[PDB]
Amino acid sequence: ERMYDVTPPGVVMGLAWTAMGGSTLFVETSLRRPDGSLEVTGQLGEVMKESARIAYTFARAFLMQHAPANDYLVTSHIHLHVPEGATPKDGPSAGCTIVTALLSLAMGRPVRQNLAMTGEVSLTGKILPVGGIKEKTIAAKRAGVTCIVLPAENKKDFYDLAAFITEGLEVHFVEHYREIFDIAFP
Numbered sequence: 001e002r003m004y005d006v007t008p009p010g011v012v013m014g015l016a017w018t019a020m021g022g023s024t025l026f027v028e029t030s031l032r033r034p035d036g037s038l039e040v041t042g043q044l045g046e047v048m049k050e051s052a053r054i055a056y057t058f059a060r061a062f063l064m065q066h067a068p069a070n071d072y073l074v075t076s077h078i079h080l081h082v083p084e085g086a087t088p089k090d091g092p093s094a095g096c097t098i099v100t101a102l103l104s105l106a107m108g109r110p111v112r113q114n115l116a117m118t119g120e121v122s123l124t125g126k127i128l129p130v131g132g133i134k135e136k137t138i139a140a141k142r143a144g145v146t147c148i149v150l151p152a153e154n155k156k157d158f159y160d161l162a163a164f165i166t167e168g169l170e171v172h173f174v175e176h177y178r179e180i181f182d183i184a185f186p
Ligand SMILES: *[B]([O])([O])[C]([C][C]([C])[C])[N]C(=O)[C]([C]C1=[C][C]=[C][C]=[C]1)[N]C(=O)C1=[C]N=[C][C]=N1
Pocket: 014, 015, 016, 017, 018, 023, 025, 087, 088, 089, 090, 091, 092, 093, 094, 130, 131, 132
């Protein structure tokens, strides 16, 4: 019950919400070898555009430590898109999602399947709490997500849900992006 059954490299499942409830969505990225650049589409608001800029800066620094020979994030012209195209989107909570998509694309490695994540990323890779955890978790469960990555400071929201919703979910409460990296790329 979602746009991708199997995600290719550069595609990651995120989580959103409104007053009506949660939903899943996908961050898509692609690149062409020609300093690189990042072009963003998907009717993104300013806060979400800034989060893409932070994620891009941090992903470049993270990849330089983890794979110094990989120059894809420093030299390529990268495009990031969040379908559906006509739907307005905003907020900082896809920061981790965007970092992961860029690293996935640069490494040519898909992320673990049936994984979704939500979490704001700071410039140094700290993972900050987000809103809508109850709604997002319900939406993840309905979409068949079995592994969900959440900010550690949102534990209380997760445990406000009835047990039958969260039972057997592999839940990871994280404080730093490097924990997310190890989950997405085992
Ligand atoms: B996250 O909660 O910040 C998320 C980021 C990304 C996945 C879109 N954004 C949202 O959930 C927003 C609500 C919002 C949160 C925080 C600040 C401002 C706005 N939701 C949406 O953008 C949305 C929801 N459903 C469908 C389409 N778009």
